[PDB]
Amino acid sequence: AVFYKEHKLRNDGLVITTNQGNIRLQFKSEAAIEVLYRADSKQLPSFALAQPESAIKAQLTETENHLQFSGGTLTARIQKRPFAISYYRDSELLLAEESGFQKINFRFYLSPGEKILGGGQRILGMDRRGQRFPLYNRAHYGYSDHSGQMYFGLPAIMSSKQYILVFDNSASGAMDIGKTESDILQLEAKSGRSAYILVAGNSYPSLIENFTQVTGRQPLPPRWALGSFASRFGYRSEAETRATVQKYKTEDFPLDTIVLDLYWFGKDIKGHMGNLDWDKENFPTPLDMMADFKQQGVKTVLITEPFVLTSSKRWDDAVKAKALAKDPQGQPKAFELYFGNGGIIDVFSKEGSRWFSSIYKDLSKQGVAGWWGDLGEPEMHPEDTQHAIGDADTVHNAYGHRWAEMLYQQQLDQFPELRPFIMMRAGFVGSQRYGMIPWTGDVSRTWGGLASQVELALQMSLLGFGYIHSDLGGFADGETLDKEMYIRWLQYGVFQPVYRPHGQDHIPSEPVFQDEETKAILRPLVKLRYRMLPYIYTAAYQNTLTGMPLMRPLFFSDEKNPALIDNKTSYFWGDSLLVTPITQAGVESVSIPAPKGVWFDFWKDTRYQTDGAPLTLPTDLHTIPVLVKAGAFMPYVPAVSTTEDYRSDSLEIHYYADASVPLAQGEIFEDDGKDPNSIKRNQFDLLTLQATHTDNQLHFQLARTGKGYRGMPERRATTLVIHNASDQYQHLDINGKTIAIAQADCASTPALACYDQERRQLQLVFTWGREALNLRLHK
């Protein structure tokens, strides 16, 4: 039995005393509240909150039976007897405690019909209601089509009632989403912080904006993160690494970054981890190697791990420095990993952080451009291991998160004018604020492994991680390449956040090591990825601004149709492309559940209209099915080998016209690709395009804002291609100057305006300078 006794307001926070102790409620924004039970006791701080100390001004009202604590949009309604808190946005009940706070236990009611996304990486179905699973980051080597527990869990859910609930607790725990008791959501942990955070929104985009406002917004990654990565487990030598960079050049595939797995520090998988320094028998001139790659516009990224083995060169030093987690006796804790006997660097301590950070600094001075942190679950984490702030089981799910923070802060301190690249397997809610770019681990080389990636990506995207991606082509096991699967995976790759084929090196992961047919298929697609950089980089910009994920679920298309939540087969890549990956062999056609409206075949320009019924498209080996939304502006630049050469002096923009879309907007975000302060300081060039489409006219208004940046082109040569253009436009005005529209020979003359009757495309070619430009087509 729990009941209200009294309350106090203190520095904008409500402190309630029950018969069981104190509860502290603080609004972290108008739409988000932190609820801390056992508020009187000492416990671990928040990990989920970007500004854990903030408490914005709320209003408090009291009645006989209730308190009401209310920000702008979110209200907490506190029933006195029995004690229970429930949460309202407007007057809509979002979530109600059942027995609430009970070794740490939170129980809430679930509503009938309520669908619950969440839990981070699981392969269970998009709606996790009916499931129970651990909150314990753990490897799932070789997974395919099912997992209740893998590398990067999140103690958070997103409901069809448009709230996000975070269990702000780092410890070994569990989530029971109406499994044991059909109407009960239960959150449990062995130890750690007894708090939860509730965030509300009026739409899924606004909920996500509100969530990232309080948990952290991802800083814009360097533009090179959107390029082509060469990766395998693993390049065995400098000569092999150099030969791979060379193979990209001689096979004419784009390449931005090469990634070195654990052989850079020793010739065997076992026994060297912790060396954190070059194996000179196999990498004899690594500074020359990295400099030579930089001359070709290619970055070098190295793997690191949490573990220092007793057989490694840095064991004695790590012990001397007190850098490793300890046992209860105060000795360094050593335990038997696959790699040999070793300890774990205590990133929660001053000593471990300073020691590890010094190593990163040194290697980064040598030329390393970015960092890969593998095994941060931590993959092995014995229970008696003691960290500076608590035991292994208490801190487990925040280890990777703190490791990202340490490395992020380090990289900002060393290179304040560059954007850190930090790729890691395990984190916590909020890790995106340290730039964490996660991948879905050691996926099997099976169609099932591919078929799960959209579900995983959407689940992580929705709760903060825009750059979630997979090892393209698959990672684990296999004896010979499954060519069709590989092709499908690298096709899908183009339309998901990071283009990083990677796998165990008994089968080649890089597209340049494939047969002639595979390359003929993939080469134009990897170039397409580069041609599309203005589209992808603009979605990245919007992710930094608002948390809007790059991949969006089909359910965003109609928020009143909760049945769409189950879809894990078609997704939006940015605003305009509906993508349906092919995830089994031999598929001859697909049924695409396109939202009602007008849609075009990206590859063939075919126009489809639908009032609700799915569209059936045939498949081919060369592409995967992609539809463009009517009203899309699709921006392209010419293909480059590396983003170091990126220019937008030449722009090509495809507008998909249909009378059903009388107003359309597009934007292109351009900056120097590298300045971490470009957004904050307005050192960018934001191009805007507006189309107004009426019965007799099609009008485009073009403009630029921002203060620009060094090297920004003043005038861009622009080709605007209008798809599904009326054959009845007779003239064009460009800023009031009338230009005749040619009706022949458009591909074969330097025409300023020409209509291609066979393709229904109207091409305009002009100069887009700094002043506003209006293009008016008239019947």
Ligand SMILES: *[C@@H]1[C@@H](N)[C@H](CO)[C@@H](O)[C@H](O)[C@H]1O
């Ligand atoms: C971690 C390890 N299992 C591999 C060896 O370092 C990597 O190649 C893999 O991508 C990671 O998940």
